[PDB]
């Protein structure tokens, strides 16, 4: 129905990522359960410590969802589980701003 995408992207929103887990894992933890994994990404703070969430990528949409329900609350990864969800890319239109009032 939504025909109009030459090779889209299917990423997943993960959360509750212990500060002991890193990308190297996020990827494997997934790529292992699903061979359609592109790579794992974990967000970090100014210091470089896992904020507690991240995002992953895949090649097949069919699997993407399967994980959301399957990998759901994945405990195997990091002492704490992982909250799977459907994230969305830059969905908006940026516009230039300007200011400069005047009175008479």
Walkthrough of the structure:
- The chain has two helices and three strands, in the order E-H-E-E-H.
- The protein has one domain (about 10-85): 2-Layer Sandwich (Alpha-Beta Plaits), CATH 3.30.70.
- With about 100 residues, the chain is of the alpha+beta class.
- Strands 1-3-2 form a three-stranded antiparallel sheet.
- It comes from Homo sapiens (Human).
- It is found in: Nucleus; Cytoplasm.
Q: Which descriptors would you attach to this protein?
A:
104 residues; alpha+beta; Alpha-Beta Plaits; 20% helix; flat; rna binding protein; RRM domain; Structural Genomics; nppsfa
End-to-end CA span:
56 Å
CATH topology: Alpha-Beta Plaits
String of helices and strands: EHEEH
Give the strand order of the largest sheet, numbering strands 1, 2, ... along the chain: 1-3-2
Structural class: alpha+beta
Instruction: Give the amount of beta strand, in percent.
Output: 15-25%
Gyration radius (Cα, Å) is 18 Å
**What can be said about the biggest beta sheet?**
3 strands, antiparallel
Number of H- or I-type helical stretches:
2
Give the proportion of residues in helices: 10-25%
Main location: nucleus
Organism: Homo sapiens (Human)
Protein name: tRNA selenocysteine 1-associated protein 1
Keywords: Cytoplasm, Nucleus, Protein biosynthesis, Repeat, RNA-binding
